[PDB]
Amino acid sequence: ESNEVLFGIASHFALEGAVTGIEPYGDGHINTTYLVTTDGPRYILQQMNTSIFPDTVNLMRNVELVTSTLKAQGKETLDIVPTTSGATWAEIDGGAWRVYKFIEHTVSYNLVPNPDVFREAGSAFGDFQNFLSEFDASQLTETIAHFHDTPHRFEDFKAALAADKLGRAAACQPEIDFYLSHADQYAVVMDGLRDGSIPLRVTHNDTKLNNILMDATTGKARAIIDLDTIMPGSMLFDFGDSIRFGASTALEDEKDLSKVHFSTELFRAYTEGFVGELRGSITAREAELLPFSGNLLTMECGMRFLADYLEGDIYFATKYPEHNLVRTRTQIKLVQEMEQKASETRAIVADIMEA
Ligand SMILES: CC(=O)N[C@@H]1[C@@H](O)[C@H](O)[C@@H](CO)O[C@@H]1O
Ligand code: NA
Known part of the structure; x- marks a missing residue:
């Protein structure tokens, strides 16, 4: 989307820095994913594909259950960043959006090196x-x-x-x-x-x-x-x-x-x-x-x-x-x-x- 729209989306979420940029991110085939840069922390912003996952409420219920259970065992997982009203995701202008904390000090692979x-x-x-x-x-x-x-x-x-x-x-x-x-x-x-x-x-x-x-x-x-x-x-x-x-x-x-x-x-x-x-x-x-x-x-x-x-x-x-x-x-x-x-x-x- 346009920057104006994306920055608008970001304003719905409880981010802990002033946003400096939002750019397409990653090789997922399903959702539309962006990296959010701020004057401090990084975030992943996703528009969920509701053609593939029509029941957003059930999907987020599952993700919340899995992640909250991992957290309650002291295990690192995806950290949902809530809306500024405390919800786990936002419906905005006919789109379903969520934010995760960016997971720092990692590497990932599309191809096994060894x-x-x-x-x-x-x-x-x-x-x-x-x-x-x-x-x-x-x-x-x-x-x-x-x-x-x-x-x-x-x-x-x-x-x-x-x-x-x-x-x-x-x-x-x-x-x-x-x-x-x-x-x-x-x-x-x-x-x-x-x-x-x-x-x-x-x-x-x-x-x-x-x-x-x-x-x-x-x-x-x-x-x-x-x-x-x-x-x-x-x-x-x-x-x-x-x-x-x-x-x-x-x-x-x-x-x-x-x-x-x-x-x-x-x-x-x-x-x-x-x-x-x-x-x-x-x-x-x-x-x-x-x-x-x-x-x-x-x-x-x-x-x-x-x-x-x-x-x-x-x-x-x-x-x-x-x-x-x-x-x-x-x-x-x-x-x-x-x-x-x-x-x-x-x-x-x-x-x-x-x-
Ligand atoms: C929800 C969904 O359709 N996920 C698919 C997965 O099934 C498939 O194996 C992969 C291919 O790279 O692309 C997507 O991740
Ligand atoms: Na089918």
């Missing part, structure tokens, strides 16, 4: 699952329905494909046919949740690497951010999504596919950290599905990118017309390598489950 960073990510998200187990499912109502229900995502994909609103399907038949041909694989986790062979757990549901902040000195995890999708699911959604984003040798939107590979060493590092924290709760069936959960979440995210391309880019932020096609192509390349390396990942999990 195995230790990714091991730490695994530990952080594994620990967060232990934390979340303290809630029962009823305390944290779903903020998005069918969120990691891959068969439901596939129904959405098939509809986007049949409609082919922009005539973009002609240019991406290999990608389309990849997702169509893997239809038989999409129900495995949902079927296990439904029949009780996979435990229903409270999960984070968007565990990509850039949703953790690490300390700039110690390298240890400081805080997990992007708390909007905390809701019931499977452990496998958090593990699989982490592998999807972080076991790649390339960015999610890397144009040069020759740079995109699935790294079994990174898979190992993350699994060491994650299982390291969850060894006392992980079931045999969950352990059996750890490698395939990577395939599943990567395919789910990929099909969502491609569906969005076919629909004219209505869901994910994009920077250029082909951006979602570029994104779906990395996800496909990753799954192709995950398939080829299946025996190796199976062996890695077995080896860690004996440690």
Whole structure:
């Protein structure tokens, strides 16, 4: 938005400095995020995407519950800065806005630079699952329905494909046919949740690497951010999504596919950290599905990118017309390598489950 509008928004919130600037910030695809600079502290200002999260009240209730519980254990988290009237968010001119304190002395990554960073990510998200187990499912109502229900995502994909609103399907038949041909694989986790062979757990549901902040000195995890999708699911959604984003040798939107590979060493590092924290709760069936959960979440995210391309880019932020096609192509390349390396990942999990 204009500066006039953004500075106006900021005046609704209990900031503790005179604002000097408000500038676009970060690589989130969903909300619209800004860095607020002041004569003292920094803030993150976000316009929440109400097309994706229509029930703002329930969403903020969940975020308040999670963050207040962390605070009450003396654990660093996202610190909501209230409105000047004490509310957790503001509805202003038809938009929903919130502010968080900027988390100082941190670093974050869109791409794993070395195995230790990714091991730490695994530990952080594994620990967060232990934390979340303290809630029962009823305390944290779903903020998005069918969120990691891959068969439901596939129904959405098939509809986007049949409609082919922009005539973009002609240019991406290999990608389309990849997702169509893997239809038989999409129900495995949902079927296990439904029949009780996979435990229903409270999960984070968007565990990509850039949703953790690490300390700039110690390298240890400081805080997990992007708390909007905390809701019931499977452990496998958090593990699989982490592998999807972080076991790649390339960015999610890397144009040069020759740079995109699935790294079994990174898979190992993350699994060491994650299982390291969850060894006392992980079931045999969950352990059996750890490698395939990577395939599943990567395919789910990929099909969502491609569906969005076919629909004219209505869901994910994009920077250029082909951006979602570029994104779906990395996800496909990753799954192709995950398939080829299946025996190796199976062996890695077995080896860690004996440690
Ligand atoms: C709420 C929502 O749709 N979040 C998505 C997440 O599911 C997806 O895996 C990611 C891809 O980078 O983008 C967004 O964060
Ligand atoms: Na739906």
